[PDB]
């Protein structure tokens, strides 16, 4: 098989809330 993805952007920046774009 071909290794997954789902790695996408983000990374690991403050759990106690999200981390996907709070626009300007």
């Amino acid at each position, epitope marked *: 098989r071909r290794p*997954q993805d789902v790695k996408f952007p983000g990374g*690991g920046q403050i*759990v106690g809330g999200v*981390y996907l774009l709070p626009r300007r």
Partner: antibody
Amino acid sequence: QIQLVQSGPELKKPGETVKISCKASGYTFTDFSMHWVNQAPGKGLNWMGWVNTETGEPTYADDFKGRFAFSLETSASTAYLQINSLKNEDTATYFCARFLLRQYFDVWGAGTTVTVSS
Amino acid sequence: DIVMSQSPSSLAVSAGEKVTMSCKSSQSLLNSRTRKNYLAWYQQKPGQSPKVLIYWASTRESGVPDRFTGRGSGTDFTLTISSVQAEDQAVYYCKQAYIPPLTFGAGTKLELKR
């Protein structure tokens, strides 16, 4: 498919120390941090805490302050869980799961059946 | 912090019927930033490890049978299995992430009749 694997169950006597495992194979280990969920017998699930699969740091919850530690040899894809001074109440089944950004657990383990007694 | 509790604590429905169990947070789960309620529900049948069925409260995972249903937002969430197949003899919990530390609900028990 994608799976996480935990050391088998383990028996220990009031006061020991213990180390369970959680080897994952199906995803870039370090590209999702690993959490530990607990579960007594017939009881509910308690959120142990988790290890930043990068930062390689741990965050314990209140009820797992001290005694309970987390670690992971980032390499052989396996994130540890270690305990100290077990107590009778320390008996319970353990877990590790992958936690994405969405905010859930897509894959957990089988869990460690660890129990503590003479 | 976010007290959690689900309800009822059992349910004995019958083949082909619709169920409605609860899970009601404690202190908001609609995260403004996201516009998603960070509620999630998990089904642990006896012995397997739990499995989540829905995320963002309402969103059904890739794999989950169309027949399970996560509604709720803000502070009043609901899970529904129409035509509850047997296999469904499980137990359901729910959790929050909107604020560490994570918390599940005592869990709602789903038995079956027949």
